[PDB]
Amino acid sequence: AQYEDGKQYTTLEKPVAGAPQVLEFFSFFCPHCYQFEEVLHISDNVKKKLPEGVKMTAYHVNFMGGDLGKDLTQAWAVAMALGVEDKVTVPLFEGVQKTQTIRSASDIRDVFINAGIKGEEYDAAWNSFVVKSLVAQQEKAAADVQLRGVPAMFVNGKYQLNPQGMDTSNMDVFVQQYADTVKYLSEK
């Protein structure tokens, strides 16, 4: 078959009840996640092909970067709570990996301030229990798919994308295949 379990995707031995329809894990410290988002634009290419009524969810992970990695998962919770993911994704990736100007929680906050989030608004979100719950949700979701590394993407809590089984010859053929596989899985 054109799509095969073990080729473009694998199947979770323990499917996750109630999981987001399309769930991406990443770290702003992960070099391959930087390529996925800033060079390949995997998330946007996937979103453009999702069936009607299917949304993409993206969660940050703690296991890269120590203290700052956890601060970034909390800041990503703030971005989710405030609905500013599209304002801060590029400056967080570039701040951590390109300019390496993000070295502390204050430097993360500066990205939000510079993007026009008011200081009081960021700080109230950072300290909120809504954000504490969002951190816990990101952690629980990684546990539920037995996450071992990033980038990673899971469809309907049942299928894990397998980019190492796709055609990696041309970067744009690869992005197309990745996005087409997510669409296929979302309809399975």
Author numbering: 1 to 188
Question: What did the published study say regarding this structure?
Answer:
This 21 kDa periplasmic protein is a dithiol oxidase that catalyses disulphide bond formation between consecutive cysteines of unfolded polypeptides as they are translocated to the periplasm. The acidity of this groove originates from a cluster of negatively charged residues (E24, E37, E38, D44, E85, D86 and E94) that map along a buried channel in the interface between the TRX and helical domains of EcDsbA.
In all three crystal structures, a glycerol molecule, used for cryoprotection, was modelled into the electron density. The binding of glycerol displaced w2 in all three structures and hindered precise analysis of the water network in these mutants. However, examination of the three lysine mutant structures showed that w1 was strictly conserved, forming hydrogen bonds to the backbone amide of C33. When E37 was present in the protein structures, water w3 was observed to form a hydrogen bond with E37 in both K58A and E24A/K58A structures. The K58A mutant exhibited an oxidation rate of 2.10 ± 0.17 × 106 M−1 s −1, which is also not statistically different from the wildtype. However, the double-mutant E24A/K58A yielded a rate constant of 1.47 ± 0.06 × 106 M−1 s −1, 35% slower than that of wildtype EcDsbA. These results indicated that E24A and K58A did influence DsbA oxidase activity, but its individual effect may be too small to be detected in this assay.
